Design an enzyme around this catalytic site. Structure first.
Site, short mmCIF file in Angstrom:
data_model
loop_
_atom_site.label_atom_id
_atom_site.label_comp_id
_atom_site.label_asym_id
_atom_site.label_seq_id
_atom_site.Cartn_x
_atom_site.Cartn_y
_atom_site.Cartn_z
N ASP A 163 17.12 -33.17 12.62
CA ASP A 163 18.18 -33.86 11.88
C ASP A 163 18.53 -35.22 12.50
O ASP A 163 19.58 -35.42 13.12
CB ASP A 163 19.43 -32.99 11.66
CG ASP A 163 20.31 -33.54 10.55
OD1 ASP A 163 20.06 -34.68 10.10
OD2 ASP A 163 21.27 -32.85 10.14
N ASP B 36 24.60 -36.73 16.64
CA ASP B 36 24.97 -35.53 15.89
C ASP B 36 24.35 -34.30 16.55
O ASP B 36 23.87 -33.39 15.87
CB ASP B 36 24.56 -35.69 14.42
CG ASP B 36 25.26 -34.72 13.49
OD1 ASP B 36 26.37 -34.27 13.81
OD2 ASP B 36 24.69 -34.42 12.42
N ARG C 16 23.65 -26.58 15.22
CA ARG C 16 23.22 -26.59 13.83
C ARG C 16 22.04 -27.52 13.60
O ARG C 16 21.28 -27.32 12.64
CB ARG C 16 24.37 -26.97 12.91
CG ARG C 16 24.95 -28.33 13.20
CD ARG C 16 26.10 -28.68 12.25
NE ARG C 16 26.81 -29.85 12.75
CZ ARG C 16 27.74 -29.80 13.69
NH1 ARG C 16 28.08 -28.63 14.22
NH2 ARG C 16 28.32 -30.91 14.12
N1 LIG Z 1 11.67 -27.76 9.67
C1 LIG Z 1 12.45 -26.77 9.20
N2 LIG Z 1 12.07 -25.51 9.33
C2 LIG Z 1 12.88 -24.48 8.84
N3 LIG Z 1 14.09 -24.81 8.22
C3 LIG Z 1 14.41 -26.11 8.11
C4 LIG Z 1 13.61 -27.08 8.58
N4 LIG Z 1 14.23 -28.24 8.33
C5 LIG Z 1 15.38 -27.98 7.70
N5 LIG Z 1 15.50 -26.66 7.57
C6 LIG Z 1 16.57 -25.85 6.94
O1 LIG Z 1 17.28 -26.80 6.12
C7 LIG Z 1 18.65 -26.79 6.60
C8 LIG Z 1 19.33 -28.14 6.36
O2 LIG Z 1 19.22 -28.96 7.53
P1 LIG Z 1 18.60 -30.44 7.41
O3 LIG Z 1 18.18 -30.60 6.00
O4 LIG Z 1 17.63 -30.68 8.49
O5 LIG Z 1 19.86 -31.43 7.68
P2 LIG Z 1 20.58 -32.31 6.52
O6 LIG Z 1 19.61 -32.73 5.48
O7 LIG Z 1 21.40 -33.35 7.17
O8 LIG Z 1 21.55 -31.21 5.85
P3 LIG Z 1 22.97 -30.83 6.50
O9 LIG Z 1 24.04 -31.20 5.54
O10 LIG Z 1 23.04 -31.33 7.89
S1 LIG Z 1 22.86 -28.82 6.59
C9 LIG Z 1 18.46 -26.53 8.08
O11 LIG Z 1 19.72 -26.18 8.70
C10 LIG Z 1 17.60 -25.32 7.94
O12 LIG Z 1 18.37 -24.30 7.31
#
Ligand SMILES: Nc1ncnc2c1ncn2[C@@H]1O[C@H](COP(=O)(O)OP(=O)(O)OP(O)(O)=S)[C@@H](O)[C@H]1O
Length: 279
Positions: free
Chosen positions: A153, A135, A139
């Site tokens: 991710d 993936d 993003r």
């Molecule tokens: N370590 C981090 N530091 C700052 N922002 C974070 C961090 N981890 C996640 N995020 C934020 O949380 C968003 C969601 O991404 P993740 O939670 O890592 O992926 P996910 O849980 O699979 O959610 P999706 O559906 O892919 S957006 C990220 O795109 C950032 O906006």
């Protein structure tokens, strides 16, 4: 992974939403109270299924195996108390695609190439550890305040739905996901970075993207893109997976370009999509 006690974690603000809603910025007390670090906190809300728990904690299990500058650090997990939490290093500029879209045109070529080198180094580490990300996309890269890019991710990562337009043809068709299909994705990430977060293939549908790729057509060069950088992304998109660069090749090439920066001044021609005729 390290189990963290809830008394050591504070949640301060909402910083984004994801699959397991939601993600907070907070602070983590460490070293028996002597240290305090900013963290991102992903939570798993009550009522989650067994599959969701396996996927949620599995992501942390993968992240906890890694120790690399360009891979997001896992501070720990709360699983003994609810709601469960994955606690990672805080990345002040969030996701790279959204960051670049809010910084359109503001970085130099050398800065963009340096971001790609960092991403490539993290991917080289990941692939060498025998993992496939599956993936890889801008993003799923995070950016800190110092412009350092880190792979994140790992929800779909595996030890040896996925968006079609980042995925190599053999992974789309045969579900053959390898480091070589991750290299294809990295090529798309290169294009995302050099365009400041444009949508790969613009308005084309998934079926239209597959039609173009299987006919041999590829994404056109970004504006202001070094010829060597476009040549490298094109190589990542070779139909035959054995012909693509390995991550070690990608890191080495980017390093050589950065250390001889006049090499980046030779630009690939940006194809004039739109004719504007003036005196
Ligand atoms: N370590 C981090 N530091 C700052 N922002 C974070 C961090 N981890 C996640 N995020 C934020 O949380 C968003 C969601 O991404 P993740 O939670 O890592 O992926 P996910 O849980 O699979 O959610 P999706 O559906 O892919 S957006 C990220 O795109 C950032 O906006």
């Amino acid at each position: 992974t390290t189990e963290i006690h809830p008394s050591c974690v504070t949640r301060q603000k909402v910083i984004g939403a994801g699959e397991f809603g939601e993600v907070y910025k907070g602070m983590l007390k460490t070293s028996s109270g002597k240290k305090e670090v900013p963290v991102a906190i992903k939570t798993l809300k009550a009522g989650y299924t067994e599959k969701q728990r396996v996927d949620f904690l599995g992501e942390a299990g993968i992240m906890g195996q890694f120790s690399h500058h360009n891979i997001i650090r896992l501070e720990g997990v709360i699983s003994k108390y609810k709601p469960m939490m994955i606690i990672t290093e805080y990345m002040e500029n969030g996701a790279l695609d959204k960051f670049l879209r809010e910084k359109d045109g503001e970085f130099s070529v050398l800065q963009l190439v340096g971001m790609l080198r960092g991403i490539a180094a993290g991917m080289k580490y990941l692939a060498n550890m025998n993992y496939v990300h599956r993936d890889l996309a801008a993003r799923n890269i995070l950016v800190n305040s110092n412009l350092v890019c880190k792979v994140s991710d790992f929800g779909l990562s595996r030890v040896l739905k996925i968006p079609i337009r980042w995925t190599a043809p053999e992974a789309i068709s045969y579900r053959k996901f390898t480091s070589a299909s991750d290299v294809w994705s990295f090529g798309i990430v290169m294009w995302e970075v050099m365009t400041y977060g444009e949508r790969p293939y613009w308005e084309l549908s998934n079926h239209e993207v597959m039609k173009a790729i299987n006919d041999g057509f590829r994404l056109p060069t970004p504006m202001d893109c070094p010829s060597a950088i476009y040549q490298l992304m094109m190589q990542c998109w070779q139909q035959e997976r054995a012909r693509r660069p390995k991550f070690a090749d990608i890191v080495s090439i980017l390093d050589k370009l950065i250390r001889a920066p006049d090499s980046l001044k030779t630009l690939a021609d940006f194809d004039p999509r739109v004719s504007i005729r003036l005196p």
